[PDB]
Every structure is written in C-alpha cells, then in structure tokens.
C-alpha cells in the first residue's frame, strides 16, 4: 500500500556547500524546482493510499464485553491491550518478519518524511473492521450497523454461495474444527514461513537499492578532475573551475533526474496495487463478492484483515 | 521574506493562501567559526637549491 | 420513495450550486497541464550554461567555430526540456486512462446495469445511476438504497413443532415478546409463521436455540372448512 | 567540539559538528569513512584524536496556515529537527513554533504528520492535536437479539472521473 516517503533537495545534493556551483545551477532554469515538486507528489500520494484502503469506516466498532462466538477462537485476529502496541497475534508476527541505516541516509542530504497515519492508527482501523465483521455481519460497510448474531450471519454467507442454511446447524462442530485449526495453521505458516511477506519486503529493498545508488552517484567524477567541490576551487582558476563544475551539474542533475523518473514509475505501480487493495477492501471484507477467484480459491465466506508494514494482509475463508 | 505568511505568498506566486501546510526553504546551520588544525613543522623547503 | 428522490436530487443541486471545490479532480488536469505547458514554455528564456539564451546574439557575436560550442549548449538542454516535457506527460497519461477505465467501468456496471459489487456505486444498495457530463471527464449520479432506521428484537435459529425443526425459507424470525414473526433482512414486514414461509430439515434435539411455537398449516384449516 | 564548524584538517576542508568518537583507528589509519564513501571521522594532525564529522544543516522549513479569509496566524514546522534556534513545541515530524498544544482529539483539519493534525480554533489561534479516529461505536451483541430496519432513505451519491 505506502511506500517510504523520501524528499531530496536538488540544490544540496548537486552542489554541496557551495557557493558558486549554485549559481552555475540558476543557468538551467526550474529543473531543480520541478525535481523537488516531483518527489513532493509521490510522497503525498503515498499517503492517499492509506486512506482509500487502511480506513473503510468513519466509526470505531468495539467489540461486547462478554464475546459468545458459537465454538470459534477469534484471539488470533482481535487485538490485545496487554501489548505495548494495540495489534493482533496475528499482525504481530507481520509486524517481526518484515524489516541507522536513515539516519547515514539524513546526513547525506536525504530526508525522510514520517508518514501522516501511524502504524498504531492503522491497527485500531483493522481491529475497527474485525470488530464489525462479527458483531456487524456485512451491514456495517452498506450504511446503519445492525445487530445479528453471528452464528445467523454464517447462514446468510452460505445461501448466497449456493450452500442451503440448514448444513449449518448439523455441522457447525466441523465447522469450527476446520477454522479453528485453519486459524492454527495460518500463525504456523507466517511464523515458521518469513519470505510469505516478500511482497513487502520487495518494496522495501526497492528503496533501500534507489536510495543507495542516489548517494554512490555523488562520488563519481561524471568526467571531471574531481568529484569534490572544494578540491576544483582550491585548485582551478575561476574560468578553469567553472568548466570542471559545469560537468559535475550536468551528470548530477541527470542522476537526480534518472532517480525522481524512477520514483514515479514505482509511484504508478504501488497506486495500481494500492486500488487493488481498496477493492478487495469493500468487495471481500466489508460485504461478500461472488466474483470468481477474487476473493480467493472457493466460494468466498468471510474475510479478516490484518495490519502489516507498508501494506495489508487479507485472510479469506473460504468454502 | 518579511514573515512566514509572506513567504507563503511568493511560494504560490498569489497573495490567497488556501487553507493548508506549504514547504518554504530548508534548515541551514551555519558553521560557529573556522577551526584550523595543522601538523607541526618547522623547516623551510630547500627551495633555494 | 418520489419525495426522498426529489429532495435528494434538489440537495445535489444544491450542492454542486454551492460547493465549487467538488469537480477540483478536473481542475487538477486544467492546472497541471497548464504548469506543464508554461515550465515548457519558461525553459527558452534559460542560458542553460550558455552565454545567453537567445540564439541570434551567440551566432552574431562569437565566430563561427565558437559559436557552435554555446548553441550546442543550448540545444542540449532544450532538447533536455522536451524529453522533461514529455516523460511528463507519459505518465501523466498513465494516470489518466486508469481513470477512465474505471469510469468506462463503471458505466458498464452501474449506469447500463445494476451492480452488485460492493460499495462499487457508491455507499448502500445500488439501484441505478446516471451519467452528466463535466469538462475532460464525467459525473455519476448514484441512486442506492440506505435503510434509515432499526428496532432490536428477539430471534431464534429454528421453530419445533411436530418435533422437526422448521426454518426460514426467505428472511429472518423476529419476535417482540409475544409471537414470532418472518420477516426479511432489509425492512420490517410481519408475516405469520407457516409451513409455506419455512421447511423441515432434520429435528428439535439438533439446532441449539431452537424455540416451540405453532406453526401455521393452511391446509388445517382448509380440510377442517 | 559540540558544535558545528568550518574545519581545516590536514589539507581537508569541510563543514560539520565536531564530535569526540568511539571508533578506535589503527596506527596507520587516519580518515575514515562511511557507507557512502563520505568521511565519517578524522585524525587531528596536531595532538592525535579521531574525531567525528556529523554532517550539519539537515531538515526542511513548512508553513502551517490556515486561509486567507480566516486569519494571517502562521505555525512554523521544522522538520526533521528539533527546536534549537527558537508556543515552541517539539513533534514526531519536527519542531513546531505557534501551535498550541491540544490534548483533546479532533479531527484532522491540516495534516502534519504521525498522526498529528493542526486546525484554526478558539480568542482563536491555531492548534495541534492527536487525529481522532471517529466516535466509539460498541456494537450490542446477543445470540437471541436482532435488528431490522424500520425505515429506509433513498440517497444520491455524486462521483466524477476524469
């Protein structure tokens, strides 16, 4: 969903500390300006996402305090208060299994912005929608959330999928002998399982390796005596440095511009992810989807969202 | 630059400034003063020669 | 159902009338465009390391070996400004035929038809929508269903009266303390509780929450008259 | 050291805050450097140290006001920093300079960041706050009980593409 929001400073990093490489920098107009326009989108856009997919409702459902689930084991899903963090048992492994190394990036000139939604914000809007879900049923996304037990709720999701009510009842035992031990098995799989969240993790590495190559660029001469400032003004004349400065810009302002291209590519990829998300968000989470292989394999029942760094994770169950 | 507001002024190129947070400059620390340390050497080059 | 649509109607009237911010999705296209075409157009009056940025002065004052050096500058970054200008504007034209995709589908989806996606139309249940046109770009008007208000009452899973356990066949058993009621999901209708509203399927011992009441043969009575 | 200086070492210029460091440097080994190649610490020439070069000037400078119509107040936003040059307050984003503090949440009118929001209110000047996350809704929840709608509104939605 969010990417790491990142705002570079095109007079810095071209022209460190120094006087006259910024004012050879006016010749080339806005290029600056409009690098650092570029860089500021992206990082409001990341936050957007949050937005149209973290936060489906405006309200806070809690849950009752005395919770009669009919033989289902939801401790997994629901968020303890116990924990420093509010977040389920659940998102508490996709919290570990996903990972200064800014701070080296903060005295290179590359700031790194916090993002407008916590993570802990991000963890009350799932344990919002959690809540909702069971006390809720699928009313609570559509308008006014009305009471239903959740045991009624189930006969509903399985008339909808072609499943006559009444094999609730007779197998509701097996029925929660399968889910709660499915629930079992999805703690085993992200715990024992850490590249399950690759995903994630890719994007992470995609901005570790973007902002890594930004920084080695500085130290390449792009065809100049040297690559330091203050070694061609401490040696050149002033015509004889402005020439030696003139290709330090040059392949500086292209490495700055190769990068802000880069990030908007990137930024046009995580938003179409980010719409996927959203959509899976009201189609298998808030309400119930009879579409094909969306919501995943089987007859779409239920699904359980779960906060995870720089994205969301959907638990579908399914028939 | 006379204050902030006005800054925000020619950063939009308007003088109406809508409701919102704007990005002026950045946050230049200036050095306190110049620090010189040097080897100690006492001899002149033989440059003569 | 007239006088809600008819007021909603004049609400969005209204607000459309008052709130002129609503339609800034399209104001952003006029305004980055019109950013996009003015940095382009600002790019000439740059030296772009030349010694000026006129072209005429450079090949009227320095000779022609020399001149050649400060135009190519020139024409370098200009030739820069126009790959800027247009890998711009490529991307920008990936943001916009992702909008109206979405807007061809839903005019698919919620105008021609009626969807059952959720949440897809807008907030309720879609009942229909209609399109209107706006500058580079539409407007859907979304008429969904919202229930309004809701009374708490007592249900049961099943009802036990011959000693097999009846159910439902279309909505819900609802009860206000005194007899139990069918009833659908969306909206309060009494109806009595009777063999043709529900159907057998196993017994009494099996539904936990099962409830005893008499249920309404219309055959009882009709043999009996 | 403690502060930051224009710094002369050794022939190397450079500006920085001078930082007694740690790292131990072999006998032969002067300057060091970091992952990005630039220079970590240094060797005072003169009396033999390693010395730390913490790069200065670091974060940006963001305008919190509400417009024009309302009132000229403005709150400064350091980001990235926090409050030294100097309602001085400090925030997960940076320092912030006229803003009062708000405990009571609201809803988020001019976004800032972590979760904190700024507005123009109540004898009015602007205020930060936590984010609310909407009213505390409890859900009733009972096997037997059950709600059915006694009413309904039909509602029209404006949505627009371009």
Same mark, same amino acid.
Request: negative net charge.
């Given at each position: ?125 799932? #344990? ?60 085993? &799989? ?121 994205? !969301? ?7 | ?15 109406? !400034? ?32 | ?15 459309? &009338? ?41 090949? &009227? ?165 | ?100 503090? !708000? ?28 984010? #609310? ?30």
């Amino acid at each position: 969903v969010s990417m790491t929001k990142t705002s570079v400073d095109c007079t810095m990093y071209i022209c460190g500390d120094s006087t006259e490489c910024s004012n050879l920098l006016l010749q080339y107009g806005s290029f600056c300006t409009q690098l650092n326009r570029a860089l500021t989108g992206i990082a409001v856009e990341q936050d957007k996402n949050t937005q149209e997919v973290f936060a489906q409702v405006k309200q806070i459902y809690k849950t009752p305090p005395i919770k009669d689930f009919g033989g289902f084991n939801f401790s997994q899903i629901l968020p303890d208060p116990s924990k420093p963090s509010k977040r389920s048992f659940i998102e508490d492994l996709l919290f570990n299994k996903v990972t200064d190394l800014i701070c080296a990036q903060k005295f290179n000139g590359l700031t790194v912005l916090p993002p407008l939604l916590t993570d802990e914000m991000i963890a009350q809007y799932t #344990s919002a929608l959690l809540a909702g879900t069971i006390t809720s049923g699928w009313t609570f996304g559509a308008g006014a959330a009305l009471q239903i037990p959740f045991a009624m709720q189930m006969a509903y999701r399985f008339n909808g999928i072609g499943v006559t009510q009444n094999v609730l009842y007779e197998n509701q035992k097996l029925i929660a002998n399968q889910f709660n031990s499915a629930i079992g098995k999805i703690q085993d &799989s992200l715990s024992s399982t850490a590249s399950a969240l690759g995903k994630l993790q890719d994007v992470v590495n995609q901005n570790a390796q973007a902002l890594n190559t930004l920084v080695k660029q500085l130290s390449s001469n792009f065809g100049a005596i040297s690559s330091v400032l203050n070694d061609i003004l401490s040696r050149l004349d002033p015509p004889e440095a402005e020439v030696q400065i003139d290709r330090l810009i040059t392949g500086r302002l292209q490495s700055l511009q190769t990068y802000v291209t880069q990030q908007l590519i990137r930024a046009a990829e995580i938003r179409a992810s980010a719409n996927l998300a959203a959509t899976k968000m009201s189609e298998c989470v808030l309400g119930q989807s009879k579409r094909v292989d969306f919501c995943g394999k089987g007859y779409h029942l239920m699904s359980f969202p779960q906060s995870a760094p720089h994205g !969301v994770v959907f638990l579908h169950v399914t028939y | 630059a006379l204050d902030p507001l006005s800054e925000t002024k020619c950063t939009l190129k308007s003088f109406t !400034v809508e409701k919102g947070i704007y990005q002026t400059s950045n946050f230049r620390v200036q050095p306190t003063e110049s620090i010189v340390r040097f080897p100690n050497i006492t001899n002149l080059c033989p440059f003569g020669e | 159902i007239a006088n809600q649509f008819n007021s909603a109607i004049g609400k969005i009237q209204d607000s459309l &009338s008052s709130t002129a911010s609503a339609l800034g999705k399209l104001q952003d296209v006029v305004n980055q465009n019109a950013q996009a075409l003015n940095t382009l157009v600002k790019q000439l009056s740059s030296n772009f390391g030349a010694i000026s940025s006129v072209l005429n002065d450079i090949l &009227s004052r320095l000779d022609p070996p020399e001149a050649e050096v400060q135009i190519d500058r020139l024409i370098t970054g200009r030739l820069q400004s126009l790959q800027t200008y247009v890998t711009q504007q490529l991307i920008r034209a990936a943001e916009i035929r992702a909008s109206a995709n979405l807007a061809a589908t839903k005019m698919s989806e919620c105008v021609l038809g009626q969807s059952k996606r959720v949440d897809f139309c807008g907030k309720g249940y879609h009942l229909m929508s209609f399109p209107q046109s706006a500058p580079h770009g539409v407007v859907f008007l979304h008429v969904t269903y919202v229930p309004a208000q809701e009374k708490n009452f007592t249900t049961a899973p099943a009802i036990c009266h011959d000693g097999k356990a009846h159910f439902p066949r279309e909505g819900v058993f609802v009860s206000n303390g005194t007899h139990w009621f069918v009833t659908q999901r969306n909206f309060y209708e009494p109806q009595i509780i009777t063999t043709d509203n529900t159907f057998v399927s196993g017994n009494c011992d099996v539904v936990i929450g099962i409830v005893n009441n008499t249920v309404y043969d219309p055959l009882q009575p009709e043999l009996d008259s | 050291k403690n502060k930051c200086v224009n710094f002369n070492f050794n022939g190397l210029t450079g500006t920085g805050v001078l930082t007694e460091s740690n790292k131990k440097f072999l006998p032969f080994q002067q300057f060091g450097r970091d992952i990005a190649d630039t220079t970590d610490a240094v060797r005072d020439p003169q009396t033999l140290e390693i010395l730390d070069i913490t790069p200065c000037s670091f974060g940006g400078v963001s305008v919190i006001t509400p417009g024009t119509n309302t009132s000229n107040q403005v709150a400064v936003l350091y980001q990235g920093v926090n409050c030294t040059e100097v309602n001085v307050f400090q925030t997960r984003a940076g320092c912030l300079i006229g803003a009062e503090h !708000v405990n009571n949440s609201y809803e988020c009118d001019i976004p800032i960041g972590a979760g904190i929001c700024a507005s123009y209110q109540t004898s009015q000047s602007i205020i930060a706050y936590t984010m #609310s996350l909407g009213a505390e809704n409890s859900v009733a929840y009972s096997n037997n009980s059950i709600a059915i709608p006694t009413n309904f509104t039909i509602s029209v939605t404006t949505e627009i593409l371009p």
